Amino acid sequence: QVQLQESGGGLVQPGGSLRLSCAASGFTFSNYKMNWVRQAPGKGLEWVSDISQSGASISYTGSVKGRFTISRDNAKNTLYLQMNSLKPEDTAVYYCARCPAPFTRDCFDVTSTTYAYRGQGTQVTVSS
Amino acid sequence: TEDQRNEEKAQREANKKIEKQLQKDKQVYRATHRLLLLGAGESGKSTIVKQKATKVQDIKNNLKEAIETIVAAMSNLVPPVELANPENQFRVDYILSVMNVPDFDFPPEFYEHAKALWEDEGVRACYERSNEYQLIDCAQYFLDKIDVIKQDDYVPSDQDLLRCRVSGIFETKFQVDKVNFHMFDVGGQRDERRKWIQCFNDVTAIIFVVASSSYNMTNRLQEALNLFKSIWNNRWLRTISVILFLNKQDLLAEKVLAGKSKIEDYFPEFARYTTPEDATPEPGEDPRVTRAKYFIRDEFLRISTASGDGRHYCYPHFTCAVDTENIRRVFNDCRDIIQRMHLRQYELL
Amino acid sequence: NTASIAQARKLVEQLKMEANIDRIKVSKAAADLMAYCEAHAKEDPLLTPVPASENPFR
Amino acid sequence: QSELDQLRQEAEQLKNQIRDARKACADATLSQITNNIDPVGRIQMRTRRTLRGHLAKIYAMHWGTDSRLLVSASQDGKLIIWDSYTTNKVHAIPLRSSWVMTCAYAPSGNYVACGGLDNICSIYNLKTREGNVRVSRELAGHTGYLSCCRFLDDNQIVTSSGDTTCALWDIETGQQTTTFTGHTGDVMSLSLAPDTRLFVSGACDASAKLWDVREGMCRQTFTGHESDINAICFFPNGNAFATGSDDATCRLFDLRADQELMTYSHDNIICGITSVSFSKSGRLLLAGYDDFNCNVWDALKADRAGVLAGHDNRVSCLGVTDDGMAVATGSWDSFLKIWN
Amino acid sequence: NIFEMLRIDEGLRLKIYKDTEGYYTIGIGHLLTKSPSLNAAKSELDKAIGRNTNGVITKDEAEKLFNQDVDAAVRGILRNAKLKPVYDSLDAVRRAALINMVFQMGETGVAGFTNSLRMLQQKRWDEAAVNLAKSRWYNQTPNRAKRVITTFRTGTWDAEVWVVGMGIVMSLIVLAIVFGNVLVITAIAKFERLQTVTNYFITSLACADLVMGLAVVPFGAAHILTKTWTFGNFWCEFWTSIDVLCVTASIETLCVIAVDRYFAITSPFKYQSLLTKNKARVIILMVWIVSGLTSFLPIQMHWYRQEAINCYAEETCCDFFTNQAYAIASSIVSFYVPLVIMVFVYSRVFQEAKRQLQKIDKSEGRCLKEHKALKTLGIIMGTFTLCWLPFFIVNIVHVIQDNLIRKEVYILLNWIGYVNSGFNPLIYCRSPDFRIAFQELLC
Ligand SMILES: Cc1ccccc1CC(C)(C)NC[C@H](O)c1ccc(O)c2c1OCC(=O)N2
């Protein structure tokens, strides 16, 4: 099969830090571009950070810039997002979803629900 | 041998005719320019597709394309259709000549034979059988209006133009400066584009319309940027140029002047970004708005310039500040695209 | 999430229904497939090159 | 509160139970029991026919049950009905929508269906007395493009769509007799049963589902694939099926064993499989690839028996005549190639 | 003549010297006495020349002795019944070789040659040359013998480094044109991807240039090698005709392609729509028709007609002579017009390129690149210029001002133009499909 289980996450006081981990399986993690997608309370999903198969090309959303660092372990088939200086606006559900096609650049995920390869996600909340 | 010898000849002939019509199809098809129109949301991408010296000549084109087909298919049908009036003979022959000629002037002589033909009971009898052979959708409409199209001062009414339309509700083929265009609207598809986006690798241009004011909302501007990068990097789409329409100019201006929602929030690199040196702001446009506008434009540009291949190009624009006409922009941008197709093909670029 | 509970419920009903079925050992399945193939293998032109003399496309 | 949690817990457990139940039946491998069997050896086909009627890229085709005529659809908006033997054109049908992602041939050869980004399945009568082929009935219930479809008979017709669902229609009534749902992505292809009792489908959720035409519910879900399943084909006896995917591997699934028996792949193939099909006996498994080639595999031993050189663009479609006397492959180069 | 021949094969001596046998020789090959005595030869030298000479003779007196010894040699050949018929049957130039042999080994030494001697009266030069090739003679003196044998074979005095020097270049050219054009045409034949309408024009080019290095160029090369036309009169006409036809077709076709690209970049929207297959083939046939009507018809009808009537009527003297009236229109039609059209065309095209680059720069904040755009034009126009320009202009130079031009310049230029046929496939067929399809035929 194909499954991605987002672990970690939870309640964190604003300014704090939280490290998201994602267990991947049912496919070769090496060939797929990986990314993190969050869903804010009662709002459509939004892309957060992506990482190329090689671990070379890495993008972040304008906001998460410098506060978020995505790192992937290929040999262990796992994805990582290190969240720092979390802000109350960061509260949302973080799914780790991988691009549909192997050996590629582009991605056509981040569809509202209705996306095959995405985790169930974790809940990250920033207390006020 | 036997009857089989005749049957082989039959399938031979049918195939011949099919080959003919297909030969007629390749010309028009290759003459057409296919465009793929798409946008993320709230871009009113249905409006651009929703919205007069050439239009007349086009109408005439349709009329002739009708009459010629009608009088031509008369004798080709199983029971060849006889004219009730043999006196229209040379008038049919005439129509059997002019058909398929470039830049036809439609002289005052033509309308006489055509109208008189549409008067012939046998011809009409042929049209009532149109369901069996292939004829253009709008025929009887323009064929009844011939005398009206005759007038030198003829000025087609809106209602008369609506029939000149080609098609699926999303599909549009429109005529501009005597150059055929066939657009497709994907709004009738769900938001997972990876499968159907492959459908156009032959598309001359992908019209991509994204709201400039969406940088706030979710940050749908970053989503649009993502969709763009993906389109630009796709293996099947690597050769396709993206004509970019940045929409909601006015809304962007409003949001920017207000100040509550700052681009640098969702685009920190903006704070270090200054308006381009060649910037040509429009009258009554705060330098701040111009700066933001150009920052977005450049945000879509940096991706197009990232490849460095030069197989395709991205032509940005600003629109929806006021409706006006973007058809001409699209046109010119396509012309450029193809010019650079030939240019690059020759290593002249 | 209330719109989601319908999906979770229905999906649990699906896995629930297709979870209970009669499955046969893979060896039997594959053995049977192999049997079918080794049976109809004489009926399969693509398997044995057709002599151009007797070939309908040649 | 916390109901959804219990639900997902029961769902996870169920998944585990099915996983294990399958792992139990796994006592052997199709590769193991075919090890002794004499191979097919390397044997290659040739191109007996090249059919050029098409201005644009061909998106799909189908063989007539008569084994002679064949239907093909192209992005140029044309639908061409050919005659393999005489390489002639029996029919040319102009489509309304230039973009067509599929077509099918009725078992009686009387009707022909198409569909595409128009989200509509157009049925055309070939038997028309009054004249040429005109649209007989167009069925639109679909919120997405029409990926695939097949005739059960001249009355009711099954289709699959990017709408995420498959549907069985009734042409005469023009409405949907039944609707199949539960795919998590675009449904790219489907395959009927020899008896049309039930039919499978591949989709973009990387899983193929087996449905029932009468019940309208999914009996079994097979997942071996890493990426979207582009095409799916039934095994001649009806007890198994093959799937091509973007993972660049074809997979065989057995219904009674409820699991993937075997994988056909190569270290030199990174490109997805556009289409697949078996041979008369079912010993050979044919798959078209984005690479422009066409790989002929051994449905038993797992080794590629041969390949088809060919079209200079990606092969869109592939089929084998009902009498298994010939193979046909459409591509993005507008050319159809018939092989023997 | 034989004076030069023996002068090279022997050498000149104005003072008494010693030959290979140690006897006393002077002048050219002339042996005064075989006596060991030093003053014994001087005596015969004095009785021969008629002077008191101390063993030094004048430059011209050696030539006197030469005409003498040669006369005597011919006499020996005539009195000798074995060499008489053989000498009788042969032409002057070969007779020189015979006399050279009678010079080296003597009439008898040449009489021991009965085989080859028979092959001389049977007019088979090569086989004879093979028999002569194996002898104690050839073995003793391979160089001289070789030159002589060759003098027998071809029947000329040619026996420099220039013959092979030009032969090799002509071989490289004849090879390039053929391999190249054949490769292009057959490549378009066995590959379905190259069937593109635009490619048909370049196919015409390929055909035009193929006949170039097949009939025209090889025959021209052989023509420069033999220093005369062996092909006959009627066929000299045929050959000249095919020449002009190939030239016209080549240049014209290049112009046509130029028009194709001008149409492509200029009116892109009208490109695919207006230009069709029937239209394209019609352009090809037009090119070849006008090319033939300006070459074959005019030439075969004697429309381009003292030296002239002489070489014309002469079967084997194939030399190009053209009246001013034919050269003006012939050149203007075959070269100049296409040249102008091309100039204006590729000019406007370059304008377009510059424009597009400008717009790009306006949209790209990311003059070195312009060069990449200029170079392709530089070679595409350059190769067509350097090759046929110096020639076709020199035509009007020979027409306008007479006796201002060398006859070497004409031929040289003409060949330079010929090479363009070989350059075409390299400066044209670079297309992506063309390349793959090309190397797939090369294994
Ligand atoms: C026969 C011979 C004897 C000696 C040297 C060369 C040759 C061969 C020649 C010169 C006849 N080749 C044809 C020459 O390339 C040529 C081509 C196209 C033309 O339009 C012209 C043309 O000649 C002059 C002209 O005004 N018209």
Side-chain angles (χ1 to χ4, degrees), chain A residues 1-111 114-128, chain B residues 1-15 17-26 28-49 52-57 59-81 83-99 101-102 104-151 154 156-157 160-164 166-177 179-201 203-254 256-276 278-323 325-349, chain C residues 1-57, chain D residues 2-41 43-128 131-171 173-340, chain E residues 1-20 22-43 45-70 72-145 147-157 159-192 194-226 230 232-278 280-304 306-318 323-368 370 373 375-400 402 405 407 409-434 436-443:
Chain A
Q1 196 173 190
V2 155
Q3 80 246 8
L4 320 166
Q5 296 176 339
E6 293 72 23
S7 59
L11 186 53
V12 60
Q13 203 61 210
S17 63
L18 186 49
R19 175 177 179 89
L20 287 177
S21 184
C22 196
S25 61
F27 69 100
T28 56
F29 185 90
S30 166
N31 314 259
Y32 293 88
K33 192 173 183 174
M34 292 295 300
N35 49 258
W36 290 96
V37 171
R38 66 182 178 190
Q39 184 164 23
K43 188 48 202 277
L45 294 70
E46 58 167 325
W47 169 76
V48 170
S49 179
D50 68 44
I51 189 171
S52 70
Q53 304 84 347
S54 63
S57 184
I58 294 180
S59 304
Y60 298 91
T61 303
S63 63
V64 306
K65 286 269 211 306
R67 317 189 303 101
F68 279 21
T69 301
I70 187 184
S71 66
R72 68 184 299 168
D73 185 324
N74 255 19
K76 204 143 56 60
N77 291 171
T78 167
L79 193 66
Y80 292 95
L81 178 56
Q82 182 71 51
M83 301 183 299
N84 290 320
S85 69
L86 279 64
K87 303 174 178 177
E89 61 187 36
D90 288 326
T91 182
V93 180
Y94 292 91
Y95 317 89
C96 113
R98 73 125 157 100
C99 297
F103 325 101
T104 197
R105 199 80 69 179
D106 55 83
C107 302
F108 284 105
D109 81 326
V110 182
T111 300
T114 180
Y115 187 71
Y117 330 103
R118 163 187 297 161
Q120 297 187 15
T122 36
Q123 180 62 64
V124 170
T125 317
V126 178
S127 180
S128 298
Chain B
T1 68
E2 310 158 350
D3 308 332
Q4 313 174 201
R5 183 183 300 271
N6 291 334
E7 290 183 353
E8 307 295 339
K9 191 168 179 58
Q11 199 172 52
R12 189 75 157 81
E13 302 297 322
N15 180 99
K17 293 202 61 177
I18 297 180
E19 288 286 3
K20 179 193 177 185
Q21 175 141 11
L22 262 171
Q23 181 64 49
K24 292 185 177 180
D25 289 284
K26 190 180 67 178
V28 47
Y29 174 71
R30 283 203 168 192
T32 316
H33 284 66
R34 314 160 69 182
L35 279 59
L36 163 59
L37 172 55
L38 60 90
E42 283 287 11
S43 302
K45 59 178 183 180
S46 181
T47 71
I48 302 182
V49 59
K52 297 178 59 183
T54 58
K55 293 300 174 299
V56 176
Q57 295 180 347
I59 300 298
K60 304 188 297 182
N61 295 337
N62 303 142
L63 186 163
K64 170 186 170 184
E65 288 167 359
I67 71 173
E68 69 180 45
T69 302
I70 301 190
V71 300
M74 288 180 53
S75 58
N76 285 282
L77 274 37
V78 177
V81 182
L83 305 70
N85 288 325
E87 63 162 306
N88 297 327
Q89 189 68 309
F90 59 80
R91 294 174 178 171
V92 182
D93 307 328
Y94 168 62
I95 308 296
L96 287 177
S97 63
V98 298
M99 57 181 178
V101 301
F104 192 72
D105 175 76
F106 301 91
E109 182 187 38
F110 167 82
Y111 298 114
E112 294 185 343
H113 303 157
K115 175 262 195 64
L117 265 180
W118 188 238
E119 288 201 61
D120 186 284
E121 292 80 39
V123 176
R124 290 182 173 183
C126 180
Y127 165 74
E128 303 303 328
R129 290 177 55 183
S130 62
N131 62 329
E132 70 184 42
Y133 62 93
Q134 275 289 325
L135 179 61
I136 71 180
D137 285 341
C138 54
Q140 206 175 13
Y141 185 103
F142 293 133
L143 265 165
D144 295 12
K145 203 161 180 58
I146 304 178
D147 300 283
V148 183
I149 305 177
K150 292 235 308 175
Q151 305 291 299
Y154 170 72
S157 62
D160 179 80
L161 298 171
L162 270 54
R163 301 300 181 270
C164 180
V166 60
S167 65
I169 185 177
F170 308 106
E171 169 179 342
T172 298
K173 54 186 61 183
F174 58 81
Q175 176 76 330
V176 169
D177 267 23
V179 181
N180 289 337
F181 282 108
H182 187 191
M183 195 168 58
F184 186 83
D185 193 337
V186 291
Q189 302 308 336
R190 302 157 56 262
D191 52 337
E192 296 188 81
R193 315 174 179 80
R194 68 180 166 278
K195 287 316 172 183
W196 61 251
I197 204 177
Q198 303 176 41
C199 288
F200 333 77
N201 55 282
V203 59
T204 67
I206 294 179
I207 299 182
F208 188 24
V209 49
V210 296
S212 306
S213 60
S214 70
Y215 74 95
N216 39 43
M217 66 178 181
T218 300
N219 190 351
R220 293 137 102 176
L221 169 62
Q222 180 54 50
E223 306 307 324
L225 282 174
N226 277 8
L227 183 54
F228 177 83
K229 205 178 70 176
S230 300
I231 292 183
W232 204 253
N233 292 342
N234 179 275
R235 69 167 296 185
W236 307 116
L237 294 175
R238 290 173 191 171
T239 67
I240 305 309
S241 296
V242 167
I243 298 178
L244 174 68
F245 280 143
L246 302 192
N247 217 69
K248 290 183 180 173
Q249 295 301 316
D250 65 320
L251 188 47
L252 172 63
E254 304 180 14
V256 168
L257 302 175
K260 303 179 189 62
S261 306
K262 227 66 187 67
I263 298 176
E264 61 189 21
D265 290 27
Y266 317 80
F267 294 78
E269 67 274 49
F270 179 44
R272 301 129 195 181
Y273 165 86
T274 60
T275 318
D278 63 23
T280 54
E282 292 175 298
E285 176 174 316
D286 189 321
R288 303 150 66 190
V289 163
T290 310
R291 175 168 149 264
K293 205 173 65 176
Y294 278 94
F295 173 78
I296 304 172
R297 193 204 58 143
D298 290 30
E299 280 308 315
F300 286 96
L301 286 171
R302 54 197 310 180
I303 294 178
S304 300
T305 63
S307 300
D309 63 323
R311 300 203 64 87
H312 54 166
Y313 289 98
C314 170
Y315 311 84
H317 285 298
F318 302 120
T319 303
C320 187
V322 176
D323 298 9
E325 178 184 8
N326 305 277
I327 296 182
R328 187 48 53 101
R329 325 196 71 173
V330 159
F331 188 90
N332 287 320
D333 298 325
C334 286
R335 179 183 174 87
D336 294 319
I337 303 176
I338 171 175
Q339 275 192 282
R340 301 184 194 181
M341 189 177 304
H342 298 133
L343 223 58
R344 173 179 169 84
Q345 177 182 335
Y346 297 150
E347 309 105 13
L348 300 169
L349 193 56
Chain C
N1 300 158
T2 59
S4 178
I5 67 86
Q7 291 302 96
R9 180 69 179 179
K10 185 191 304 177
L11 288 176
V12 168
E13 295 301 330
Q14 185 61 65
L15 282 179
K16 196 174 185 177
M17 188 186 64
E18 71 187 36
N20 258 271
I21 70 178
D22 293 90
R23 299 181 179 86
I24 76 175
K25 273 185 171 180
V26 150
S27 67
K28 174 195 169 182
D32 286 28
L33 292 175
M34 171 187 59
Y36 186 92
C37 286
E38 288 186 328
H40 301 55
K42 300 178 183 179
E43 301 186 3
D44 191 339
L46 314 169
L47 207 59
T48 301
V50 179
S53 46
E54 212 69 45
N55 187 320
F57 287 85
Chain D
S2 183
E3 181 196 39
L4 201 65
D5 303 328
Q6 88 195 36
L7 271 180
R8 271 158 169 161
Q9 182 176 183
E10 185 182 16
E12 179 181 358
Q13 183 189 4
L14 271 173
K15 280 201 187 72
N16 285 25
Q17 175 175 337
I18 299 179
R19 171 180 297 103
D20 298 342
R22 289 176 175 180
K23 183 192 185 65
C25 298
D27 69 325
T29 82
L30 189 153
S31 178
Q32 277 177 311
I33 89 182
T34 59
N35 177 81
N36 310 278
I37 305 176
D38 297 19
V40 182
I43 306 184
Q44 66 170 32
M45 305 178 173
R46 305 173 186 173
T47 301
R48 317 305 183 178
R49 295 298 189 286
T50 300
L51 307 165
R52 323 172 174 83
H54 284 288
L55 317 173
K57 53 171 185 293
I58 306 181
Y59 236 84
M61 56 79 68
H62 204 191
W63 279 99
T65 63
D66 54 277
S67 290
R68 186 178 186 100
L69 305 179
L70 78 87
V71 172
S72 62
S74 177
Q75 293 287 63
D76 51 35
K78 284 291 186 176
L79 186 59
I80 301 179
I81 297 191
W82 314 70
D83 181 331
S84 57
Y85 300 106
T86 63
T87 187
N88 280 329
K89 310 278 234 305
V90 173
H91 281 94
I93 321 177
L95 301 184
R96 279 304 170 185
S97 181
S98 296
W99 291 266
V100 52
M101 293 181 61
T102 188
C103 74
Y105 215 157
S108 66
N110 292 330
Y111 299 80
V112 158
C114 61
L117 298 182
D118 64 307
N119 300 14
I120 307 178
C121 192
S122 296
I123 308 288
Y124 303 154
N125 178 19
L126 304 173
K127 249 54 184 180
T128 59
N132 301 327
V133 286
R134 228 207 68 180
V135 188
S136 75
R137 193 130 183 88
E138 71 174 17
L139 325 163
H142 273 298
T143 65
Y145 63 85
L146 203 65
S147 66
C148 182
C149 66
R150 295 308 199 217
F151 281 103
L152 295 180
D153 63 282
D154 283 23
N155 185 227
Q156 51 187 347
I157 179 182
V158 64
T159 66
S160 61
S161 170
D163 77 329
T164 293
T165 73
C166 278
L168 168 63
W169 300 75
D170 180 318
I171 303 167
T173 61
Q175 74 176 35
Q176 290 176 317
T177 303
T178 171
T179 285
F180 315 86
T181 60
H183 269 294
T184 316
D186 302 9
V187 190
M188 294 310 298
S189 184
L190 58 82
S191 194
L192 289 178
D195 54 18
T196 68
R197 199 80 80 219
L198 45 66
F199 75 102
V200 294
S201 64
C204 289
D205 53 12
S207 66
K209 279 180 175 296
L210 176 102
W211 312 82
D212 174 8
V213 174
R214 180 184 55 83
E215 287 288 42
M217 50 179 52
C218 173
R219 293 193 184 283
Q220 310 178 205
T221 308
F222 309 83
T223 72
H225 283 292
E226 301 191 5
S227 288
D228 321 289
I229 296 181
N230 299 157
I232 189 163
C233 174
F234 245 116
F235 189 69
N237 78 335
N239 286 77
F241 67 79
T243 54
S245 178
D246 296 274
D247 53 30
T249 81
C250 287
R251 295 174 187 261
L252 180 59
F253 302 83
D254 188 273
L255 307 180
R256 298 188 309 173
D258 190 34
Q259 51 183 303
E260 60 167 316
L261 289 180
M262 167 149 290
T263 291
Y264 316 93
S265 72
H266 190 48
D267 287 273
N268 295 132
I269 310 170
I270 54 79
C271 71
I273 296 82
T274 55
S275 51
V276 298
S277 181
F278 284 106
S279 37
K280 197 73 174 63
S281 69
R283 183 63 193 281
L284 292 185
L285 180 58
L286 317 186
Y289 293 73
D290 295 324
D291 69 347
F292 307 173
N293 298 279
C294 188
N295 292 8
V296 173
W297 301 86
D298 183 325
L300 298 187
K301 305 228 59 177
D303 301 325
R304 78 150 81 191
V307 78
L308 309 188
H311 325 252
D312 307 324
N313 210 309
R314 65 183 292 179
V315 295
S316 55
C317 50
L318 202 179
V320 171
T321 59
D322 294 25
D323 76 332
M325 187 59 66
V327 179
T329 59
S331 173
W332 277 17
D333 62 9
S334 90
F335 299 149
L336 268 167
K337 293 295 192 58
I338 303 180
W339 314 67
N340 264 175
Chain E
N1 193 25
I2 186 179
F3 184 69
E4 309 289 349
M5 188 181 182
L6 261 300
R7 190 170 78 181
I8 308 181
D9 297 332
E10 169 61 57
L12 189 63
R13 288 292 189 269
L14 298 177
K15 198 180 88 301
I16 295 183
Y17 76 109
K18 302 177 181 179
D19 65 280
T20 62
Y23 299 142
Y24 280 63
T25 305
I26 192 181
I28 310 178
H30 180 117
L31 191 161
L32 291 172
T33 195
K34 304 200 304 177
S35 176
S37 181
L38 176 74
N39 205 272
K42 304 169 60 180
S43 188
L45 179 55
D46 292 24
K47 266 213 166 189
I49 76 169
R51 186 164 49 89
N52 190 24
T53 182
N54 298 330
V56 177
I57 72 172
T58 310
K59 189 86 171 187
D60 74 320
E61 302 198 293
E63 177 169 320
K64 232 285 176 55
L65 266 185
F66 181 78
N67 282 321
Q68 169 184 299
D69 282 15
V70 167
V74 182
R75 298 185 176 285
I77 303 181
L78 295 181
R79 58 154 172 253
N80 187 284
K82 201 163 297 181
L83 294 171
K84 189 182 184 304
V86 188
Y87 171 83
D88 293 333
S89 294
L90 288 189
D91 62 27
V93 57
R94 288 170 169 85
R95 283 183 167 187
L98 179 53
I99 303 181
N100 190 29
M101 310 193 61
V102 173
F103 235 83
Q104 189 174 350
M105 37 199 49
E107 77 157 2
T108 57
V110 184
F113 275 127
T114 301
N115 277 12
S116 307
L117 292 182
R118 184 190 70 258
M119 285 180 291
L120 288 188
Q121 56 198 21
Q122 293 181 336
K123 297 184 183 62
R124 59 176 70 176
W125 314 133
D126 298 282
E127 314 176 30
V130 178
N131 273 27
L132 299 155
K134 20 187 165 60
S135 53
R136 200 49 160 71
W137 164 50
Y138 159 89
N139 286 338
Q140 202 60 19
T141 55
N143 322 276
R144 178 184 187 180
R147 294 189 303 275
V148 184
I149 314 172
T150 59
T151 302
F152 273 114
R153 294 174 51 255
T154 55
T156 55
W157 309 89
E160 326 174 20
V161 180
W162 198 253
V163 184
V164 179
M166 303 302 292
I168 58 179
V169 179
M170 301 170 184
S171 296
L172 303 178
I173 296 180
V174 168
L175 185 65
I177 300 187
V178 170
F179 172 84
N181 287 286
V182 168
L183 190 60
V184 174
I185 302 185
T186 65
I188 300 174
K190 308 215 67 174
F191 292 92
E192 57 283 347
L194 274 53
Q195 299 289 341
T196 77
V197 175
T198 294
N199 245 16
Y200 281 42
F201 285 137
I202 217 182
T203 303
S204 178
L205 179 62
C207 298
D209 298 318
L210 184 53
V211 177
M212 180 75 63
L214 195 50
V216 182
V217 174
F219 285 1
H223 180 273
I224 308 178
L225 296 177
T226 308
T230 312
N233 231 342
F234 177 74
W235 200 261
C236 155
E237 302 165 355
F238 177 97
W239 172 83
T240 304
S241 300
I242 206 173
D243 187 332
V244 181
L245 177 59
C246 261
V247 179
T248 307
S250 185
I251 308 303
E252 288 251 309
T253 297
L254 291 187
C255 180
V256 176
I257 283 186
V259 178
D260 178 32
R261 311 189 177 186
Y262 175 84
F263 271 48
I265 313 173
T266 289
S267 309
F269 287 152
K270 306 79 173 181
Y271 181 73
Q272 296 81 196
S273 181
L274 291 182
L275 303 172
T276 65
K277 172 176 295 183
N278 284 332
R281 290 203 194 99
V282 155
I283 309 302
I284 303 290
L285 197 64
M286 181 66 179
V287 172
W288 283 100
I289 287 179
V290 180
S291 294
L293 270 52
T294 190
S295 60
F296 278 51
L297 293 185
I299 288 187
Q300 302 306 277
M301 292 304 185
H302 298 191
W303 290 356
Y304 70 110
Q306 174 60 297
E307 196 178 29
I309 316 297
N310 287 327
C311 184
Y312 283 146
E314 193 67 271
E315 296 278 282
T316 54
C317 166
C318 200
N323 64 92
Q324 166 179 9
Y326 175 87
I328 303 179
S330 179
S331 296
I332 290 181
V333 169
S334 294
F335 181 85
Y336 294 90
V337 169
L339 178 55
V340 182
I341 306 177
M342 287 182 59
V343 173
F344 177 78
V345 151
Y346 290 170
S347 290
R348 178 150 156 84
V349 153
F350 165 82
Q351 212 68 207
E352 290 291 42
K354 185 180 179 181
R355 171 191 172 193
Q356 300 294 358
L357 269 176
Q358 184 64 39
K359 322 184 75 171
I360 289 181
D361 173 84
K362 191 169 187 178
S363 304
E364 174 178 342
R366 291 72 189 177
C367 297
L368 301 173
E370 307 165 347
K375 185 159 190 173
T376 60
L377 299 159
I379 51 92
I380 193 176
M381 276 307 208
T383 298
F384 168 84
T385 294
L386 309 186
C387 296
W388 294 97
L389 188 76
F391 174 79
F392 269 84
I393 295 188
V394 151
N395 246 327
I396 306 303
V397 178
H398 201 176
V399 167
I400 288 185
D402 205 78
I405 296 189
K407 244 310 173 183
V409 176
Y410 202 84
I411 308 179
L412 182 61
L413 296 175
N414 222 144
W415 273 81
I416 295 183
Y418 285 168
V419 191
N420 181 85
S421 298
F423 288 146
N424 279 307
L426 296 179
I427 310 183
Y428 277 69
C429 303
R430 312 178 61 91
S431 166
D433 304 324
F434 254 114
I436 299 179
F438 266 144
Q439 69 179 17
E440 184 166 343
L441 295 172
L442 289 179
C443 305

